Design a protein around this ligand. Sequence first.
Ligand SMILES: [Mg+2]
Ligand SMILES: [Mg+2]
Ligand SMILES: [Mg+2]
Ligand SMILES: [Mg+2]
Lengths: 97, 205, 147
Amino acid sequence: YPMAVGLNKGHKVTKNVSKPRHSRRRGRLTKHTKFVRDMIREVCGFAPYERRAMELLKVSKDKRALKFIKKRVGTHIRAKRKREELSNVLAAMRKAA
Amino acid sequence: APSRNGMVLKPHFHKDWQRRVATWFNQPARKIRRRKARQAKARRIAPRPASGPIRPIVRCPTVRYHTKVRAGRGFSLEELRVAGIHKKVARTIGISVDPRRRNKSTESLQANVQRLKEYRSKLILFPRKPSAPKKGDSSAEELKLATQLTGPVMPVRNVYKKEKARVITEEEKNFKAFASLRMARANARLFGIRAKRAKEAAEQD
Amino acid sequence: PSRLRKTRKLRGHVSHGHGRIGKHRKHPGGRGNAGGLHHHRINFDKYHPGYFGKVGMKHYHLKRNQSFCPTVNLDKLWTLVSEQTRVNAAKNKTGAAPIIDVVRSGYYKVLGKGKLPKQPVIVKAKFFSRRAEEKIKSVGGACVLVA
RNA sequence: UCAGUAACGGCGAGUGAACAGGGAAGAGCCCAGCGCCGAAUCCCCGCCCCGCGGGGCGCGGGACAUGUGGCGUACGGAAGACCCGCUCCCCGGCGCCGCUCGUGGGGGGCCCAAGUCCUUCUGAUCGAGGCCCAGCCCGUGGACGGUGUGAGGCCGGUAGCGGCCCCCGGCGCGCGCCCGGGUCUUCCCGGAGUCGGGUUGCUUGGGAAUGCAGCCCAAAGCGGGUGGUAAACUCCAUCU
RNA sequence: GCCGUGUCGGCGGCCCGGCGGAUCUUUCCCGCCCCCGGGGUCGGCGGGGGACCGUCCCCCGGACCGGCGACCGGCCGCCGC
RNA sequence: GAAAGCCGCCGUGGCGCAAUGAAGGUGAAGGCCGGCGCGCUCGCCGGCCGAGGUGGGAUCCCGAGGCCUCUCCAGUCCGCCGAGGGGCACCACCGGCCCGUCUCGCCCGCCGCGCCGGGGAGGUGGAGCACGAGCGCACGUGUUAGGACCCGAAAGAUGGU
RNA sequence: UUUAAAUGGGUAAGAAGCCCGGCUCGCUGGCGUGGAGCCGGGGUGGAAUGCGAGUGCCUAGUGGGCCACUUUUGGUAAGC
RNA sequence: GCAGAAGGGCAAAAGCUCGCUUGAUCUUGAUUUUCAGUACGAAUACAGACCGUGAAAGCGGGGCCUCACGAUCCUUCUGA
Ligand SMILES: [Mg+2]
Ligand SMILES: [Mg+2]
Ligand SMILES: [Mg+2]
Ligand SMILES: [Mg+2]
């Protein structure tokens, strides 16, 4: 009983399933590249804003720690992914000792 | 400056508009120029057809136009893959290829695949010196004409169905009404709200 | 035709049809729509009421294709097909009702407008109004929906 | 076309794009990176194959270059190894013959028919006349000049008219280059003081900031950008 | 001899007739989908066919006027030779 | 001949054919007949039709009577004709319908029984409906934007000598 | 200001009027009450004088006035 | 005397005292005044609610009547 408005909208056609376009697999980690970036964060180190960040993230609190990364790196959605990868440095330093 | 009952008007002539005027006195002089750009191209090519390659069946976007069929850019890889021809050999056959086009329907996928096999069976190629791989004898008895016109297989051909006559039965003259629009129109907009009240009674204990 | 116009008949008279006193100068009232509140106010009410102010919601980047639906009401409803159909439709063959889809005629919604004739139909449209479906359900017709 | 429309604006005066749709025209590609091949690459000089109108592939020396030239590769995916059934190619140069659709271009010099009889006049190109073949020519009655108004006296104009001289795009002997496609399996897969955020100017229809620029802060990798009302949550779309 | 307008017929020329029609025919004909190498109208798809209706082309009758469409015969009254 | 002609599966598009609301959205046919539900201030089923009514309304229709060389018997006509009838456009009025709001209210519907859908009755807002009139071209007048009927500054800006 | 002119202002001088019969109502209410509405019928000659009216569109110029009887305000008066 | 500037009006009152109150509330139109026959303001007659007062008919949607005030755009609060 097909109709144009509603929750089951539109002319009912059948889907073409296919392997996706190759450019959409663009920022994958590709383990060799994971090796390169992880080899280089121990020859080089951490930025001065993010060494001050993990010295709030171990003792002070986390809500004031994210509000700090909110300001230096731009958005909110970048601030949480930066915060949970600092907490995983802080876990690998402490909890693997 | 105004007067009795008339229109209030915004002519956009407050800018120096006499310098940027474009008067079309050469417009017959250019229509007879780009006829010559077609004629002296059509005999320039070959018995290869005028007006370029073959285009796909393509349905238009944007609800106003989605009921019709247009000629597109290129057939693309998915449709070239099923038809069997190579993606870079296709444009020396005379078939345009648009690799950035997607197929997400199967009805319109098979339409252009049926279109593209129909083309190759009414195509005759010319081997250089007559070895002829995948080609036979004398060229379709000299190919019945020379050069085509404004589209190979009449690329719009917007066609509709017959659907001749039915008898008005019960459950058909009874149900599918205006009310089924208004209820389905309401159920789309009360859908996210009612699934929020459903969470509220699940946290009710 | 500069021959047939007023300035030939008005050539020889001193003020050229503009007055000895007023003596048409350049722009005595202001240029364009000047004074629309101030000294041309009596003109802008009484001939353009409503002309100044906000009235609604702002809608950024509307596209004039999403709200597109042409309408055919029931008086014009039978000219979409041949006149050869409906004379063939009523010749004692059962209740065999012909199809009329307005979507291949370029219409989306079927509205009401009285005197739909006595034959049964099936009407294929994307939308309907409830006056229109109860004219069609009154002549024994059906009202089938399409997306 | 949308459209003087959504929008901007002492919301005053004014300003004001786009997407579908119809057409013109249509054509696509390459690198860095990731690996692979013993730098397999280029420039310059010297004498020569052997040449015209000079450019080289061939020979031996000096450099460039591993801080990375060249080959196969680019996001539509790619590579290697399999297995499977095909296949022998294209490019330029050199001679010469055959054409070029208005019938290839450039230049020169040519190609119809009254100056007949009377008559006017400074002088005619005026005016009148030419058998029942219509006085003559006409694919030539555009024009201009000649003592005045000229199809025929003269340049010309008409014509896939003729003949001349040079220049041009493309068939065939000798160089140079030359294994593609499908299926599966394994491995590879990308551009940073950039994106973005803040604030400050300009600009835009772009409005809780469309674009650009300064200064400050400065990324990620199932990431990033966009989805036209700021934000948090989520799902989907789309692009790279 | 003649053509106009309604009535038709010979379905005549429809298969050696034109066009038009979102009339009809799931028994025709071609490339296919739906189940157990074959099969079921078993519901259709792309294309072609041929019936029907609408209008324009000839044959025989019939209807009127023979209307600025005409010629021949005969009549009247003019005309010139 | 920079003309003219043709296209139609080149009508895409433009304006018109449908209005209303900020918007979500909705979106223009009634009158009679026969019967029934408490014929309940409300309605329901079937048939007939089909844009309601009133008052004016050009024109047209009917028309007793009237008008003609001798009197009773018949014809076409024409003129006059009181009165009567169907009434165009159009105007005034009353009623109806569609959209927005407002008050009062009750019933129905089911791809799912709900902070769901539909309907009613009265009152008001609209540039509506109530059997379509526009579109193209041309000309005229008027208004406007442009140097704008011609001529006129004192000023202002850029860049130079 | 008790009283109160003259000139002046509005209305009326019929058929959209008058009379009679019936019917609707949810308004009104002792009440076949009240009042409107609608339908049906019955009778045209309704002061003088003069004149053919009704309507709709588009619309220019104008937006400095000035004088005289008579009535009046300011001013001593004024071609104020 | 009725708040005041004047005029109108007003006597078991529109004045004075007392008793109860919040109609100085909610809502759609119509009309008048200024007038272009527009708005604002102010006013009139209603109608639909909800209330007051009174034994009651009634009266009351501010002041006995004539003046007592203000668009677009912006902000603010309120309403479903
Ligand atoms: Mg004059
Ligand atoms: Mg004038
Ligand atoms: Mg003037
Ligand atoms: Mg200056």
